[PDB]
Chain A
Amino acid sequence: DWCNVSLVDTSVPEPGILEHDPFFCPPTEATARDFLADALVTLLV
């Protein structure tokens, strides 16, 4: 059938990260103190 003869040639058909930033959540930094020496002073006076 010559009517459905198809010819095709070459053509030019030419058509991940994860991150979220919150603002802050710092813990108790510099965790050290004492309430004896000052108590000793104010109970030694």
Chain B
Amino acid sequence: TSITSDIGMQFFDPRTQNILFSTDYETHEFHLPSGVKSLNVQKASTERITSNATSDLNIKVDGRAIVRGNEGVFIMGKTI
């Protein structure tokens, strides 16, 4: 169901006259939708990664892991 133009897709509910969805990204800022399972973003600025109180975080990667601490790293744990 392809579409094509210079600007792109649009949609706004006429009962609000607010653009509920657009694809001229420079104008309207994108927001995170609800109900998302995973997201694969090519660059992340994360303050903290944490799990929930049941299962284990797994920083797993087929590639190489390069963790660099500019002021230093501190590993705290029971069995390391």
Identify the A interface with B (CB < 8 A). Answer: 16-18
Measured in the bound complex, the distance between the Cα atoms of B15 and A17 in whole Å is 5
Interface of A is mostly: loop
Residues of B within 8 A of A16 (CB): 15-16
Nearest chain A residue, comparing its CB with the CB of B17: A16
Show 6 A/B contacts (Cβ-Cβ < 8 Å), sorted by A. A16-B15, A16-B16, A17-B15, A18-B13, A18-B14, A18-B15
Interface residues of B in 1-50 (CB under 8 A from A): 13-16
The 6 closest A-B pairs by CB, nearest first: A16-B15, A18-B14, A18-B15, A16-B16, A17-B15, A18-B13
Nearest chain A CB to B20's CB is how many angstroms away?
13
